């Protein structure tokens, strides 16, 4: 029984913490989203076999260039995340996250994760983005980025509805095994 280390990286407020809380507890955290996700370890059943999955949030580390990399050594799989309703976070995948992760961890598998899937279709979110001269990231755009950075897979999910959530971590585990 190996303890598989999965580290979640990406811009602040792409909902890394929300995603982890929603998965580990199952239920959506509710109207108050906790700020803190402490390291979690539990057995998950993937393809008929038990796996000890260790989950790490990086929330709070994003602006600190020398402290940020402390989380990386001995990671088995990265989830590099961006919000589907934030083009700025999408651009930082290629500009910041992928190159930093690749430098520290040459051989570690990456899953590219688009978050906040529930909001891409939301009327009010489409309005306020259009208001800011912006448009949500489409599936083909996300897929294209995943190929560009050599990610194992591109996946979209919603912490709120849990759509595609189980799949993200299943695929992370499969990418290691």
């Amino acid at each position: 029984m190996q303890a598989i280390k999965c580290v979640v990286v990406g811009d602040g407020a792409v909902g890394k913490t929300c995603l982890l809380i929603s998965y580990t507890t199952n239920a959506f955290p509710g109207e108050y989203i906790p700020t803190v996700f402490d390291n979690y370890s539990a057995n998950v059943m993937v393809d008929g076999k038990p796996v000890n999955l260790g989950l790490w949030d990086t929330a709070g580390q994003e602006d600190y260039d020398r402290l940020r990399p402390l989380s990386y050594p001995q990671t088995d799989v990265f989830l590099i995340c961006f919000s589907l309703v934030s083009p700025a976070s999408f651009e930082n995948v290629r500009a910041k996250w992928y190159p930093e992760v690749r430098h520290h961890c040459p051989n570690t598998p990456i899953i590219l994760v688009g978050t906040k899937l529930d909001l891409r279709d939301d009327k009010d979110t489409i309005e306020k983005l259009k208001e800011k001269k912006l448009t949500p990231i489409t599936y083909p755009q996300g897929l294209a980025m995943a190929k560009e950075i050599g990610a194992v897979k591109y996946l979209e999910c919603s912490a709120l509805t849990q759509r595609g959530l189980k799949t993200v971590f299943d695929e992370a585990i499969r990418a290691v095994l």
Binding site: Y32, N39, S41
Partner: protein, 367 residues
């Protein structure tokens, strides 16, 4: 719903601090205490660093935090964070050494089966095998970088404009702290580089770190007044000087330390050059580089070095600011935030002794 979120956030601050302090306690009681019977003092020091200081500080922090939260309106909460900001600078040491600690722990555990087995037992006793000691050692880095996040959220939720303002002071303090910890790590990394350079240089007049931060080093050809043709040299550029050396085997012999307080830059293979000349001096150097690209790179680094010695607004408002290495915790006279790092953190006015960040010199009240 804003007030509901405010109260949830206050509860999370306390509950997560309780959990963290307990995690530190578990490291001390379930790992450190048992391992003392297995590991030499030298090993204990390398692996656990200042975790016991962290436990002491946070035990007291938690008590004061709970007191603040139990008081009417939690109105003194911001004060607790501000009060502990400088005490939390102990994270500078922790985060600078945690890589080395983790590396050393892995090495001892791989070498010694009995230590590996004891570690497995300790993990079982502490947390039912959920977390290794190696993982636990990273929890302090994680925690110190949560404070600014918790406060950022608290500020958002509260509809009390007075409380927002006060909490913003605490938010500023915890962002400042995080930056300080980041810069301490950076300075310790830079100092390792300096020590390595120093060991390879012969005939140094003083500690290399006295010259500031390394900028660039490499091969060049140099002419002087005393020596007119192109001579092969190896140079190290730091903030305060160009150290001109001659490679002798695997080491470098110092021939000249060119003081950058005085010397200024005036703009086929080895033809690409610029002058390093003193304002009114009898000595001038021509620096030749193999390629135009190398010439550009060096000139850019000389600009950076001179900007550090003579920053924008160095003599603004009657002051005379000079690069200074602070040996005690110090606040900037303009912005009131901490000078960051472990050496040459900023500037000190020669006249009035006011400390300041490079970016803040023009905003320090008149000398």
């Amino acid at each position: 719903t804003e007030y509901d979120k405010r109260c949830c956030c206050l509860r999370e601050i306390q509950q997560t601090e309780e959990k963290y302090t307990d995690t530190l306690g578990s490291i001390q009681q379930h790992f450190m205490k048992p391992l003392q019977r297995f590991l030499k003092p030298q090993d204990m020091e390398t692996i656990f660093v200042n975790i016991e200081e962290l436990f002491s500080v946070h035990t007291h922090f938690l008590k004061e935090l709970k007191d603040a939260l139990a008081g009417p309106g939690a109105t003194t909460l911001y004060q607790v964070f501000i009060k502990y900001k400088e005490r939390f600078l102990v994270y500078g040491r922790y985060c600078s050494q945690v890589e080395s600690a983790s590396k050393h722990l892995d090495q001892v555990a791989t070498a010694r089966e009995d230590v590996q087995m004891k570690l497995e037992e300790c993990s079982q006793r502490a947390n039912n095998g959920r977390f290794t000691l190696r993982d636990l050692l990273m929890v302090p880095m994680q925690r110190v970088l949560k404070y600014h996040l918790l406060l950022q959220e608290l500020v958002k939720h509260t509809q009390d404009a007075t409380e927002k303002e006060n909490l913003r002071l605490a938010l500023d303090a915890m962002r400042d702290l995080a930056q300080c910890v980041n810069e301490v790590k950076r300075d310790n990394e830079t100092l390792r580089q300096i020590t390595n350079f120093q060991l390879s240089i012969e005939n140094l007049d003083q500690s290399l770190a006295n010259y500031g931060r390394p900028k660039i080093d490499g091969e060049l050809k140099i002419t002087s007044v005393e020596r007119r043709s192109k001579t092969d040299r190896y140079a190290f550029l730091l903030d305060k000087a160009l150290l001109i050396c001659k490679r002798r085997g695997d080491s470098y012999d110092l021939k000249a330390s060119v003081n950058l307080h005085s010397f200024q830059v005036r703009d086929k293979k080895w033809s690409h050059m610029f002058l390093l000349i003193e304002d009114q001096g009898a000595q001038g150097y021509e620096l030749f580089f193999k390629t135009r690209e190398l010439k550009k790179k060096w000139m850019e680094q000389f600009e950076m070095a001179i900007s550090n010695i003579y920053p924008e607004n160095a003599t603004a408002n009657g002051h005379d600011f000079q690069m200074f290495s602070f040996e005690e915790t110090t606040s900037c006279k303009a912005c009131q935030m901490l000078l960051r790092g472990t050496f040459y953190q900023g500037y000190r006015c020669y006249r009035c002794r006011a400390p300041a960040h490079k970016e803040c010199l023009g905003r320090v009240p008149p000398c």
